[PDB]
Curated annotation (Swiss-Prot):
Pfam entry (one): Globin
Sorted UniProt keywords: Cytoplasm, Heme, Iron, Metal-binding, Muscle protein, Oxidoreductase, Oxygen transport, Phosphoprotein, Transport
Residues with the Phosphoserine modification: 4
Enzyme class: oxidoreductase
Presence of keyword Transport: yes
GO BP terms: removal of superoxide radicals
Protein name as catalogued: Myoglobin
Binding-site positions, nitrite: 65
InterPro entries: Globin (IPR000971), Globin-like_sf (IPR009050), Myoglobin (IPR002335)
Phosphothreonine found at: 68
Cellular compartments annotated: Cytoplasm, Sarcoplasm
EC number per UniProt: 1.7.-.-, 1.11.1.-
Domain of life (superkingdom): Eukaryota
Protein backbone atom coordinates (compact mmCIF):
# COMPACT_ATOMS: atom_id res chain seq x y z
CA UNK A 1 0.00 0.00 0.00
CA UNK A 2 1.01 3.60 -0.48
CA UNK A 3 -0.06 6.45 1.74
CA UNK A 4 -0.55 9.93 0.26
CA UNK A 5 1.40 12.83 1.78
CA UNK A 6 -1.95 14.07 3.16
CA UNK A 7 -2.42 10.76 5.02
CA UNK A 8 1.12 10.87 6.41
CA UNK A 9 0.40 14.42 7.63
CA UNK A 10 -2.62 13.19 9.61
CA UNK A 11 -0.49 10.43 11.13
CA UNK A 12 2.44 12.71 12.08
CA UNK A 13 0.13 15.40 13.42
CA UNK A 14 -1.42 13.13 16.06
CA UNK A 15 1.95 11.43 16.65
CA UNK A 16 3.39 14.85 17.66
CA UNK A 17 0.78 14.98 20.43
CA UNK A 18 1.66 11.44 21.62
CA UNK A 19 5.35 12.47 21.83
CA UNK A 20 4.48 15.14 24.46
CA UNK A 21 4.10 12.18 26.87
CA UNK A 22 5.69 9.02 25.47
CA UNK A 23 5.78 7.11 28.75
CA UNK A 24 2.13 7.87 29.60
CA UNK A 25 1.00 6.75 26.16
CA UNK A 26 3.21 3.58 26.36
CA UNK A 27 1.57 2.63 29.68
CA UNK A 28 -1.98 3.22 28.37
CA UNK A 29 -1.33 1.17 25.27
CA UNK A 30 0.17 -1.87 27.05
CA UNK A 31 -2.47 -1.96 29.74
CA UNK A 32 -5.21 -1.78 27.09
CA UNK A 33 -3.47 -4.64 25.21
CA UNK A 34 -2.96 -6.79 28.34
CA UNK A 35 -6.57 -6.23 29.41
CA UNK A 36 -8.21 -6.77 25.98
CA UNK A 37 -5.97 -9.70 25.09
CA UNK A 38 -4.48 -11.37 28.12
CA UNK A 39 -2.89 -14.05 25.97
CA UNK A 40 -0.38 -11.43 24.85
CA UNK A 41 0.97 -10.99 28.41
CA UNK A 42 2.14 -14.59 28.27
CA UNK A 43 4.72 -13.60 25.63
CA UNK A 44 6.56 -11.37 28.12
CA UNK A 45 8.58 -13.46 30.63
CA UNK A 46 9.32 -10.13 32.24
CA UNK A 47 5.69 -9.11 32.93
CA UNK A 48 3.73 -12.37 33.05
CA UNK A 49 3.33 -12.18 36.79
CA UNK A 50 1.39 -8.88 36.79
CA UNK A 51 -2.12 -9.66 37.99
CA UNK A 52 -4.01 -6.38 37.91
CA UNK A 53 -4.08 -3.02 36.20
CA UNK A 54 -2.83 -1.47 39.39
CA UNK A 55 0.28 -3.60 39.32
CA UNK A 56 0.78 -2.84 35.61
CA UNK A 57 0.55 0.91 36.32
CA UNK A 58 3.00 0.51 39.17
CA UNK A 59 5.61 -1.36 37.16
CA UNK A 60 8.53 0.86 36.20
CA UNK A 61 9.87 -1.94 33.95
CA UNK A 62 6.64 -1.92 31.86
CA UNK A 63 6.80 1.88 31.66
CA UNK A 64 10.36 1.69 30.31
CA UNK A 65 9.36 -0.93 27.76
CA UNK A 66 6.39 1.14 26.52
CA UNK A 67 8.88 4.01 25.91
CA UNK A 68 11.20 1.71 23.89
CA UNK A 69 8.25 0.39 21.86
CA UNK A 70 6.76 3.81 21.01
CA UNK A 71 10.17 5.30 20.23
CA UNK A 72 10.83 2.49 17.75
CA UNK A 73 7.36 2.83 16.14
CA UNK A 74 7.69 6.60 15.96
CA UNK A 75 11.04 6.20 14.11
CA UNK A 76 9.24 3.99 11.63
CA UNK A 77 6.25 6.32 11.09
CA UNK A 78 8.59 9.25 10.54
CA UNK A 79 10.16 7.47 7.56
CA UNK A 80 6.78 7.76 5.69
CA UNK A 81 7.05 4.29 4.15
CA UNK A 82 10.86 4.26 3.62
CA UNK A 83 11.38 2.00 6.62
CA UNK A 84 13.08 -1.08 5.23
CA UNK A 85 16.22 -0.59 7.40
CA UNK A 86 14.28 0.01 10.61
CA UNK A 87 12.10 -3.02 10.04
CA UNK A 88 14.87 -5.59 9.61
CA UNK A 89 16.05 -5.90 13.22
CA UNK A 90 12.51 -5.64 14.61
CA UNK A 91 11.27 -8.41 12.29
CA UNK A 92 14.25 -10.62 13.22
CA UNK A 93 13.78 -10.31 16.98
CA UNK A 94 10.00 -10.60 16.90
CA UNK A 95 10.07 -13.58 14.56
CA UNK A 96 12.95 -15.58 16.01
CA UNK A 97 13.55 -14.54 19.59
CA UNK A 98 10.12 -13.48 20.80
CA UNK A 99 7.90 -15.47 18.43
CA UNK A 100 5.12 -12.93 17.94
CA UNK A 101 2.37 -13.90 15.51
CA UNK A 102 1.01 -11.24 13.17
CA UNK A 103 -2.32 -11.56 14.95
CA UNK A 104 -0.71 -10.02 18.06
CA UNK A 105 0.57 -7.06 15.99
CA UNK A 106 -3.09 -6.60 14.94
CA UNK A 107 -4.05 -6.51 18.64
CA UNK A 108 -1.53 -3.80 19.61
CA UNK A 109 -2.64 -1.81 16.54
CA UNK A 110 -6.15 -1.86 17.95
CA UNK A 111 -4.76 -0.78 21.37
CA UNK A 112 -2.94 2.16 19.75
CA UNK A 113 -6.01 3.29 17.88
CA UNK A 114 -8.18 2.98 21.08
CA UNK A 115 -5.76 5.11 23.13
CA UNK A 116 -5.32 7.84 20.42
CA UNK A 117 -9.11 7.96 20.10
CA UNK A 118 -9.54 8.35 23.87
CA UNK A 119 -6.78 10.91 24.46
CA UNK A 120 -6.88 12.98 21.20
CA UNK A 121 -10.45 13.16 19.86
CA UNK A 122 -9.84 16.58 18.30
CA UNK A 123 -6.87 15.31 16.28
CA UNK A 124 -8.20 11.83 15.63
CA UNK A 125 -11.47 12.21 13.73
CA UNK A 126 -12.42 9.60 11.10
CA UNK A 127 -10.00 10.76 8.43
CA UNK A 128 -7.05 10.76 10.90
CA UNK A 129 -7.99 7.31 12.26
CA UNK A 130 -8.25 5.95 8.68
CA UNK A 131 -4.77 7.39 7.97
CA UNK A 132 -3.35 5.81 11.17
CA UNK A 133 -5.01 2.53 10.31
CA UNK A 134 -3.39 2.54 6.82
CA UNK A 135 0.02 3.38 8.34
CA UNK A 136 -0.24 0.45 10.80
CA UNK A 137 -1.55 -1.84 8.06
CA UNK A 138 1.48 -0.88 5.95
CA UNK A 139 3.72 -1.70 8.94
CA UNK A 140 2.02 -5.09 9.48
CA UNK A 141 2.12 -6.04 5.75
CA UNK A 142 5.84 -5.18 5.53
CA UNK A 143 6.70 -7.06 8.76
CA UNK A 144 4.65 -10.04 7.52
CA UNK A 145 6.73 -10.13 4.31
CA UNK A 146 9.93 -10.05 6.35
CA UNK A 147 8.61 -12.80 8.65
CA UNK A 148 8.22 -14.98 5.62
CA UNK A 149 11.71 -14.28 4.32
CA UNK A 150 13.05 -15.09 7.77
CA UNK A 151 11.27 -18.47 7.96
CA UNK A 152 8.53 -17.63 10.45
CA UNK A 153 5.48 -16.23 8.65
CA UNK A 154 2.75 -16.77 11.23
C1 LIG B 1 3.97 -1.86 17.51
C2 LIG B 1 4.54 -3.08 17.41
C3 LIG B 1 5.81 -3.34 18.24
C4 LIG B 1 6.97 -2.67 18.24
C5 LIG B 1 7.41 -1.43 17.41
C6 LIG B 1 7.85 -3.42 19.17
C7 LIG B 1 9.13 -3.04 19.47
C8 LIG B 1 9.96 -3.71 20.31
C9 LIG B 1 11.35 -3.29 20.66
C10 LIG B 1 12.13 -2.10 20.07
C11 LIG B 1 11.81 -4.18 21.56
C12 LIG B 1 13.24 -4.31 22.13
C13 LIG B 1 14.29 -4.79 21.10
C14 LIG B 1 13.89 -6.11 20.49
O1 LIG B 1 13.94 -7.16 21.20
O2 LIG B 1 13.53 -6.16 19.29
C15 LIG B 1 10.75 -5.19 21.74
C16 LIG B 1 10.90 -6.32 22.58
C17 LIG B 1 9.87 -7.20 22.82
N1 LIG B 1 8.68 -7.29 22.20
FE1 LIG B 1 7.92 -5.90 20.93
N2 LIG B 1 7.19 -4.51 19.63
C18 LIG B 1 5.98 -4.54 19.10
C19 LIG B 1 4.96 -5.46 19.36
C20 LIG B 1 5.05 -6.56 20.18
C21 LIG B 1 3.90 -7.41 20.57
C22 LIG B 1 2.47 -7.25 20.01
C23 LIG B 1 4.38 -8.34 21.41
C24 LIG B 1 3.74 -9.51 22.16
C25 LIG B 1 2.38 -9.62 22.18
C26 LIG B 1 5.82 -8.06 21.62
C27 LIG B 1 6.68 -8.80 22.39
C28 LIG B 1 7.97 -8.35 22.70
C29 LIG B 1 8.85 -9.05 23.64
C30 LIG B 1 8.43 -10.35 24.39
C31 LIG B 1 9.98 -8.35 23.72
C32 LIG B 1 11.18 -8.55 24.67
C33 LIG B 1 10.85 -7.76 26.01
C34 LIG B 1 11.88 -8.07 27.08
O3 LIG B 1 11.88 -9.17 27.68
O4 LIG B 1 12.79 -7.25 27.22
N3 LIG B 1 6.10 -6.98 20.89
N4 LIG B 1 9.73 -4.82 20.99
Amino acid sequence: MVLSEGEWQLVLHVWAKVEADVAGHGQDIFIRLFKSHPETLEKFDRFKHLKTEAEMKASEDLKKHGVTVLTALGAILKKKGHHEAELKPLAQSHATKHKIPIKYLEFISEAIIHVLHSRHPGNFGADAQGAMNKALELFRKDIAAKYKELGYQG
